[PDB]
């Protein structure tokens, strides 16, 4: 009955997914052109890159 120890399994799963979701948002593209910064500063002008 693996659901018996679900109290601590949920804790460790929330600790894991909180870090995995935080790092997954790093590769996001919120209203931008690229997710990485090297493809933005070296492709767009400073007035628009900022």
């Amino acid at each position: 009955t693996p659901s018996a120890l679900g109290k601590l399994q949920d804790v460790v799963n929330h600790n894991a997914q909180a870090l995995n979701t935080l790092v997954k948002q790093l590769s996001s593209k919120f209203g931008a052109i690229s997710s990485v910064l090297n493809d933005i500063l070296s492709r767009l002008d400073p007035p628009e890159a900022e």
Binding site: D45, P46, P47, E48
Partner: protein, 50 residues
């Protein structure tokens, strides 16, 4: 606190390059202004003297 008055002579089709963030021969290799320039750009035709 302190005001700097830069003076020079350029052509007519080069006056637009004095604005911040512009690109051209005068903007890049002659006179560059930062993206956060604070001040006023003044230009008038001096064909009768220059």
């Amino acid at each position: 606190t302190n005001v700097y008055a830069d003076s020079f002579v350029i052509r007519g089709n080069e006056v637009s390059q004095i604005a911040p963030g512009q690109t051209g021969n005068i903007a890049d290799y002659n006179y560059k202004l930062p993206d956060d320039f604070t001040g006023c750009v003044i230009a008038w035709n001096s064909n009768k003297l220059d």
